Amino acid sequence: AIHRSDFPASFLFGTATSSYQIEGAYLEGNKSLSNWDVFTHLPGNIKDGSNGDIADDHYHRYEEDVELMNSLGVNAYRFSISWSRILPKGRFGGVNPAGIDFYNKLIDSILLKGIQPFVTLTHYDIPQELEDRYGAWLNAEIQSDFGHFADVCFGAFGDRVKYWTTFNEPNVAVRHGYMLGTYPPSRCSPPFGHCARGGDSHAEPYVAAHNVILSHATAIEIYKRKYQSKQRGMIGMVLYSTWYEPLRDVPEDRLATERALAFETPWFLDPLVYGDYPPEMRQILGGRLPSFSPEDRRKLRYKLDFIGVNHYTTLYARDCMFSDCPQGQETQHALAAVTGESNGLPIGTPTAMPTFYVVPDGIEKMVKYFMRRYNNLPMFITENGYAQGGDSYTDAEDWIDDEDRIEYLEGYLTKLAKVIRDGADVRGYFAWSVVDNFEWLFGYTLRFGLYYIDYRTQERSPKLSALWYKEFLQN
């Protein structure tokens, strides 16, 4: 139904991964332990008790994986840099040459094939030492550690990297880390949970996000002052971007939907474009959102060059400001509750990933929301994809037969082409993911790959969706 010629000639088409999810070699090349290395070696977090010690062994097998994505006909590859490989002990501990060498080799390998790097600096990971030393995102010192990490990466790689992302889904990582306590550093308080480390779910998430925002600001100021004129790249941020519809078409749910939306991506994007937190959030949270100092505001004037849209799903939102709702969900402070069901029944076909429903027009509506709120600031679809999982899959052939993924990709790409025809400045699309990999708390139980991975042998095998994406990119 949809074809490559339905998109602009200069459009990026790629796949996306992250370092912890694919690399393995978790203690090789003088790399230090990350937050996720430490976390996954504790019990009671990952669904299948797995970890990323080995993952897809991409640290050793990257050349094969580059060859595979090249065989699909991609012109870009979205990946992240392991902080713990570059600055194992943070900014006073010296740059790790083996880490620099690994990413130089990866970058050179993709560019040899005409595949453009689209690089995420941080994608949930930090060296554990930064948590241990000063509590990572709860201390403003992280801004300097992140700034230094950015500076090193720009200097080492930026002659060949023209697209950078500071952070991947900090809206997810912050709320899971400090509100629900289900991600490291596993901090929370009632009514969200009882976290043995302590926490404050009504304060700490907002401090953490504040420091993420200002870490971005620190990094992009460095980029614009030191590197932009020579390197001519763009610096963005990637946000988890769910579309929301009112459960009932009445003002209270419409307003709740607008709150649900404003509490997600604008939490980060309003500061980076307008210099203040969303007024929807400020009205409710007041002083729980920290202020931006004059020094902060100087850095915020560098803004961001693009919005990285990680869009997978669409949900209904309903009001909790004037109705009593269950407490302790991540949407609590927004005074909305979200659900995939209306009168018991799904918004679109359910999938193996909780909250992920097949709702293609969500990508159009999400893009239009950014267009209206941010005056059509450039966007890239930095992740979109479909997970397989569960008892229907006993062997490779079952995973390979992924017509369900094809239908998803086809539908969402159809709607993306439409929103671009309608004026949206979307400049690329990245399928999550080229390979099955470690899906955070779900471990290996969810498989998002265009390629199937046998974790016993590390064999890569193309699923039907790999063949489909190749056909699509051939036009």
Numbering used by the authors: 26 to 500
Q: How did the manuscript describe this experimental structure?
A:
Rice Os4BGlu18 is a monolignol β-glucosidase which exhibited high substrate specificity for the monolignol glucosides, coniferin (kcat/Km, 31.9 mM-1s-1), syringin (kcat/Km, 24.0 mM-1s-1), and p-coumaryl alcohol glucoside (kcat/Km, 1.4 mM-1s-1). The Os4BGlu18 structures exhibited the typical (β/α)8 TIM barrel found in other known structures of GH1 β-glucosidases. The general acid/base for catalysis is Glu194, which is located in the conserved TFNEP motif found in strand β4 of the barrel. The nucleophile residue, Glu408, is present in the ITENG motif at the C-terminal end of strand β7, consistent with Os4BGlu18 following the double displacement mechanism described for GH1.
